[PDB]
Ligand binder design. Structure first.
Ligand code: CDL
Ligand code: CDL
Ligand code: 3PE
Ligand code: 3PH
Ligand code: HEC
Ligand code: HEM
Ligand code: HEM
Ligand code: HEM
Ligand code: HEM
Ligand code: UQ6
Ligand code: UQ6
Lengths: 55, 238, 76, 41, 373, 373, 76
């Protein structure tokens, strides 16, 4: 029994490892697209705003 | 049409990846020689990081080039230094401009120049070094060149790679060929930024199926042994 | 469903537990002979159509080439 | 024989051994696989 | 549970023949491929834009900026190819083993085949490459062949004078919606079959020897799923462009038409036939018949034996049919010039004569040899 | 015939109670509305583009340049409103007549209700107006409630730091794909019901008086379909903008925010509850419970009579429940200021106390009055 | 299905053909009385609640406005 089931248990981990990987990559797909991440850029001009104003 | 031969490329390997120094050298070539007329629109300075250049090297490469659009307080489009998010420069503002600055011919975007053509890497190299004198009986008009590989053997593009056309920063002798091989690797790179990665997935995939299949078959054979050993006997009461 | 599928009589059927029998009894012992037995009962029905497909494919290719090859006599 | 009687006979334990093994298998597989890929290229 | 009954009526306690070979796996593979396509298609739909200015840009954005987006796109394309491989082998199993005598199952099948071909055609139009645009114009033009209402129909589908954005967007909608109709038709396909049960390779009544499915044949479908996934991932991760065309990686230029226009491989057999018939209309009709001849197949069975396991002359004719189907697939690829054309013309004549004439006459002869006729 | 067997079983020879009122029409109307939505949605999908630069332009192009495109768009919007009207009356019929004792049918129902609300939310995001963008952000940031799992999940749906094109395109894909899952869940809904048959307004065993469905409840469903079509069209062709919002006719400005923001009418009752609970998380939970309290409903039935036809005290409590549901619908509309807030807080307290506490106690009292308890 | 739904006994059931009977027998003759009979039987259990709703509605609206109204003493 332990020989036959060990094969079932072995296979399971393998499948389990692939299944987490496949499912993982899809979740990553719905995640930020490379381009969207490339937005850390920004600029402002202090002179633009005078006291008591928001921009 | 002449059918470009098969060249022993490293990346052609099944489990072999792209030589990244060759992709860096081929990106230099575009930057200097072929960029002024062709357009790598779908490739941006961001894609290079972790492939050929570091973050600061690609940032310097992007800030050498300059963007010219995007509105301002006056809705005034202005020219600004490009960033890691900006895409590669374009040779001409519009398709017409291309026809105008290239003798009427339109230089195709190289963004995917190789995936586009059939010979792919092989074809590009074949042509790049395939420039040759038109034989007797054939005559080409101005703005045309007899490149056996090019369809019709009349490519508007003049031969762009003269030995020592540009100097490789790495110092590897800039022979015409060394330059054509580097730019073919690079153009390949753009067409598939994941050549290497896909191949890493294919390795692990092979291994995984390599362990799952035999096992699943075994089980298929446990649960089917019962029947495959079944012995039938007919015993008419007689 | 099962129970109402068919009517058989006096057909005894013996079997063994999976764990009690070898998983691959004589797998390559008789498997090879059998696979070979099988191939020789079906090869004459299967193979000669694909053989003449190979001949027609090659022929077409070569014929096409010759067709493309310039007529030396022509243009002279 | 001990293993069967301990972690492979009770289905609950069967699942436990599977899950735990899988949890570690990934570590080992990824590590081993990566070594190979790197060596290749 | 009332719902559980359905499961134990169609997948667990279903009495299946004990001797069905690996070919009977293929239909289940098709169902898996359908889900796979739907799943991958859904993850293409979260980033694809059906605008002619942005469709190629969205496809390149999927391949280059979405995390593992190249993986999902090439899985979708090679899964369409795997779908047609499994479909052709499923139809070949049905033709060889006499499974077309399940007439309702066969007719729902040929409806599913028509729907899958239409879905794959519009899906190939969807990336808006050079090859997609010229391919669409070509087949849409096929409709114009219609004797009286052709022009209108073509213009309707195109949604304008010529394929343009109007088409792309409605082709995106139709390509989205048809695989769910395919899933419903597959449910009807499974129903019309359980009423009769599956066939066996000997073609005999297998009621004396039937086994369960869940414990017995599932591990077989799981193994077939694993092998099909191995072939699909070695198609995606190692040779992602051996089945596609390079000219689809160029943007759609209406001013230039790629000189060598070839429909995708699995449409080739049809393409050959169309090209073979000189008359445009004739080609369209023959093309249709090419697929429809199958539906016509259950009325051509003139033998007293269901399967071809004990029928060697019709086995020879069947393998000649598979042979010239492969020949028609090759010809479609070849350009228009001697002698590719003649082969195409013959191969089409031989295809229709083997299916229509030679197999029932051979079945009559085989019945005469066994002292039955 | 296998199919006709199925057909005759669910629509022709199905034994239905003879005394079911017009309220039992409503579920069939919902199915018709679903098909109508799907059909209109398909004809919106042939011209809509899910790009933030072109979504508003594509919607205006549908309304102005497509032949009868304004008709299909406003039929889609007012058909979503008609769907929620018929859904609310269907749920009210189920609550009043004790139909929640069909527990599996009720649970598949509340799953369908959740799916329909999600579909309508993403569909309202789809035209990319001012109101759609601020509504999406607001309703999505709601998900940002969960402390550890929430924040990331939000941007996950947003597919980025803030809703932007990334969202629009995946919302188009979901909104396309969920009504087919709704159709499959409705098939499961119909199955889990035929096992038990429909209920009657008296709440008694109607096995002694059942009639066919083809000539008796088919022409009745046809008449109900005709009346529902009269109300929809007269809410499209004469009062087309009655149920909508004017600020959705402005383009989506991330820099400005519509001053007065409100969910559409159907989602208000929930909106009120959310606003009522001071704690953000509390609001989200209560909101969910608002819908989920229904699922919980079959375990709260403490009466020996199934229907409310012979139960006057629980009838009074039911109409008070309908009354403060209308009150919560009104409050959601009202802005944040006295005394709208207090009403909202009470109305929510009264809603949960009537469903949770008052109806089983009243059923116990009613059983005591008939000398049963 | 029909035939196995229920067991009744000695319940005779007479009926007439559709075309043999008037389509709207005394439709407004008794319809009105009945509709009126019906309403008075549930009106006391339906309207009362909603009446109070109209009331809360009104009170609510008016109260709000008053809140917005400038306080006379305010600023004075
Ligand atoms: C391109 C085509 C892509 C097709 C993708 C899907 C293929 C599904 C195949 C499923 C399958 O083969 O599993 C059943 C089958 C059941 O196992 P079996 O009882 O030993 O079958 C022996 C014969 O294959 C039993 O052979 P058979 O008499 O059942 O029929 C021959 C068999 C194909 O086998 C052949 O002998 C002909 C191959 C050509 O049928 C096919 O698979 C047709 C494949 C056409 C390609 O499993 C296999 O054949 C593969 C075993 C892999 C073991 C790996 C161990 C490590
Ligand atoms: C009061 C004036 C009318 C009158 O005296 O007639 C007596 C009559 C009452 O006679 P009864 O013997 O007490 O009741 C037997 C039914 O009339 C037996 O026929 P019925 O009235 O049940 O007819 C089938 C029923 C079938 O009803 C449905 O299928 C309704 C479907 C759902 C509603 C429409 C969907 C959209 C809902 C959006 C909210 O049609 C209606 O209930 C129409 C209701 C119209 C109300 C009056 C305003 C017009 O009143 C009506 O027949 C009302 C319908 C005709 C007006
Ligand atoms: C609306 C008022 C309809 C009406 O006419 O009220 C009286 C009527 C009495 O019905 P009943 O007591 O069953 O007597 C039937 C005698 N033939 O009352 C009825 O006809 C019964 C109505 C039951 C369903 C009412 C649904 C009202 C809307 C509820 C929406 C919200 C439900 C919860 C959503 C969450
Ligand atoms: C869920 C269905 C799983 C079906 C079986 C998947 C087996 C995958 C085995 C390879 C795993 C692997 O290579 O890991 C690294 C690799 C990821 O690379 P890394 O992230 O760089 O480690 O994972 C995969 O290759 C996933 C392969 C996905 C496709 C597998 C078959 C899916 C069929 C369609 C399903 C819809
Ligand atoms: C300064 C001008 C110029 C430079 C530099 C240039 N090209 Fe071109 N190229 C053209 C023009 C013009 C065409 C179009 C010719 C035609 O279509 O007949 C062209 C076409 C091509 C084509 C075939 C596509 C086509 O439409 O002809 C390939 C492949 C190509 N170029 C490769 C390269 C490579 C590789 C480099 C540098 C490593 C390069 N080119 C640099 C002008 C240039
Ligand atoms: C409802 C399920 C499906 C959805 C949502 C879907 C969606 C898409 C989308 C968005 C594309 C464009 C991106 C791309 O180029 O791949 C596409 C392309 C494609 N689809 Fe589908 N699809 C579905 C089902 C199918 C099925 C069942 C088939 C096979 C019959 C199929 C075959 C294709 C093909 C061949 C392409 C073109 C692949 C290429 O670019 O080379 N799709 N699909
Ligand atoms: C949409 C593509 C199809 C799918 C998903 C599909 C799926 C299936 C499935 C799951 C089965 C039951 C499992 C099996 O018999 O192997 C089956 C059986 C069958 N299919 Fe298909 N099928 C498709 C197309 C077709 C076509 C085009 C035909 C006709 C040429 C066809 C004819 C049959 C027949 C005759 C059977 C019964 C086989 C037998 O038991 O002898 N199917 N199909
Ligand atoms: C997708 C929207 C829905 C549709 C199309 C729908 C449709 C139907 C239909 C056609 C019936 C058969 C009753 C009849 O027509 O006479 C029915 C029964 C029922 N539905 Fe719904 N329904 C929907 C949503 C819901 C929801 C959300 C619930 C739960 C709150 C629900 C609970 C029930 C119950 C309990 C029954 C059995 C009542 C009876 O027939 O006596 N349904 N539904
Ligand atoms: C497969 C079925 C469906 C498809 C293909 C579909 C498709 C679409 C599309 C493309 C739009 C955007 C066009 C526009 O807003 O004018 C849209 C909008 C909308 N859909 Fe759907 N839809 C479907 C089902 C539904 C359902 C079931 C509902 C109700 C839950 C719904 C409610 C809406 C709403 C409320 C809008 C926004 C209306 C507005 O702009 O004011 N749709 N639908
Ligand atoms: C004995 O005859 C049968 C049989 O009766 C059944 C039900 C199945 C099971 C069929 C499948 C598992 C395939 C299901 C087909 C689908 C299309 C699944 C639904 C997919 C959707 C996308 C919905 C068999 O594989 C089979 O042959 C061995
Ligand atoms: C008497 O009891 C019943 C009844 O038993 C059934 C099955 C139905 C179902 C009949 C319909 C016409 C409704 C159809 C149901 C759907 C869920 C439509 C689904 C739409 C899809 C596109 C799927 C009833 O409408 C009904 O009461 C009138």
């Amino acid at each position: 029994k332990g020989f036959s089931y060990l094969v079932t248990a072995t296979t399971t981990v393998g499948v389990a490892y692939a299944a987490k990987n496949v499912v993982s990559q899809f979740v990553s797909s719905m995640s930020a697209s490379a381009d969207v991440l490339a937005m850390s850029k920004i600029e402002i001009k202090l002179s633009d705003i005078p006291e008591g104003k928001n921009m | 049409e002449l059918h470009p031969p098969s060249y022993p490329w490293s990346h052609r390997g099944l489990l072999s990846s792209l030589d990244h120094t060759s992709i860096r050298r081929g990106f230099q070539v575009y930057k200097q020689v072929c960029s002024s007329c062709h357009s790598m629109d779908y490739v941006a300075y961001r894609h290079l990081v972790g492939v050929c250049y570091t973050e600061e090297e690609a940032k310097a490469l992007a800030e050498e080039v300059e963007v010219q659009d995007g509105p301002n307080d006056d809705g005034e489009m202005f020219m600004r230094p490009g960033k890691l998010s900006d895409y590669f420069p374009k040779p001409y503002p519009n398709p017409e401009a291309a026809r105008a600055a290239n003798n009427g011919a339109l230089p195709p975007d190289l963004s995917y120049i190789v995936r586009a053509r059939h010979g792919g890497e092989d074809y590009v190299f074949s042509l790049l070094t395939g420039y040759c004198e038109p034989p007797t009986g054939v005559s080409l008009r101005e703005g045309l060149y007899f490149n056996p590989y090019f369809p019709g053997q009349a490519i508007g593009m003049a031969p762009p790679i003269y030995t020592e056309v540009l100097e490789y920063d790495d110092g590897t002798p800039a022979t015409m060929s060394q330059v054509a091989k580097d730019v073919a690797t690079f153009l390949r790179w753009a067409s598939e930024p994941e050549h290497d990665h896909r191949k890493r997935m294919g390795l692990k995939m092979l291994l995984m199926m390599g362990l799952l299949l035999p096992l699943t078959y075994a089980m298929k054979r446990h649960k089917w042994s019962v029947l495959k050993s079944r012995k039938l006997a007919y015993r008419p009461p007689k | 469903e099962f129970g109402n599928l068919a009517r058989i009589r006096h057909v005894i059927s013996y079997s063994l537990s999976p764990f009690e029998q070898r998983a691959f009894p004589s797998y390559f012992s008789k498997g090879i002979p059998n696979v070979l037995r099988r191939t020789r009962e079906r090869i004459l029905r299967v193979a000669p159509p694909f053989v003449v497909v190979y001949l027609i494919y090659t022929w077409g290719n070569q014929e096409f080439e010759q067709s493309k090859r310039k007529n030396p006599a022509m243009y002279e | 024989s001990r293993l069967y009687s301990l972690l492979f006979r009770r289905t609950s334990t069967f699942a436990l051994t599977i899950a735990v093994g899988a949890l570690f298998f990934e570590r080992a597989f990824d590590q081993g696989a990566d070594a190979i890929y790197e060596h290749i290229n | 549970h009332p719902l559980f009954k359905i499961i134990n009526h169609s997948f667990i306690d279903l009495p299946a023949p004990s001797n069905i070979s690996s070919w009977w796996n293929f239909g289940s593979l098709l169902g898996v491929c359908l889900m796979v396509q739907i799943i991958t298609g859904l993850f293409l739909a979260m980033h694809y834009t059906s605008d002619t200015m942005t469709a190629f840009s969205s496809v390149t954005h999927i391949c280059r900026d979405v995390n593992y987006g190249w993986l999902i796109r090439y899985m979708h394309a090679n899964g369409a190819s795997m779908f047609f491989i499994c479909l052709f082998l499923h139809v070949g199993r049905g033709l060889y083993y006499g499974s077309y005598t399940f007439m309702e199952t066969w007719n729902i099948g040929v409806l599913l085949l028509f729907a899958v071909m239409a879905t794959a055609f519009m899906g190939y139009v969807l990336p808006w490459g050079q090859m997609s645009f010229w391919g669409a114009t070509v087949i849409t033009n096929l409709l114009s062949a219609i004797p009286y209402i052709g022009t209108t129909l073509v213009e309707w589908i195109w949604g304008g004078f010529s394929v343009d954005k109007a088409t792309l967007t409605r082709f995106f909608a139709f390509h989205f919606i048809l695989p769910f109709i395919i899933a419903a038709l597959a449910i009807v396909h499974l129903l019309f079959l359980h009423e009769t049960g599956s066939n066996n390779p000997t073609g005999l009544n297998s009621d004396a020897d039937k086994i369960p499915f869940h414990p017995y044949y599932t591990i077989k479908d799981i193994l077939g799923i694993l092998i099909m996934f191995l072939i699909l991932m070695t198609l995606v991760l190692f040779f992602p462009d051996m089945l596609g065309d390079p000219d689809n990686y160029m943007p759609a230029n209406p001013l230039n038409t790629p000189p060598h226009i070839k429909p995708e491989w699995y449409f080739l057999f049809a393409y050959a036939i169309l090209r073979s018939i000189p008359n445009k209309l004739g080609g369209v009709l023959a093309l249709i018949l090419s697929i429809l001849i199958l539906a016509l197949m259950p009325f051509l069975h003139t033998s007293k034996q269901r399967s071809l396991m004990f029928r060697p002359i019709t086995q020879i004719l069947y393998w000649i049919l598979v042979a010239n189907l492969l020949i028609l697939t090759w010809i479609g690829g070849q350009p228009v010039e001697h002698p590719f054309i003649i082969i195409g013309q013959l191969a089409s004549i031989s295809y229709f004569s083997i299916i229509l004439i030679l197999m029932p006459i051979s079945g009559i002869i085989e019945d005469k040899m066994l002292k039955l006729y």
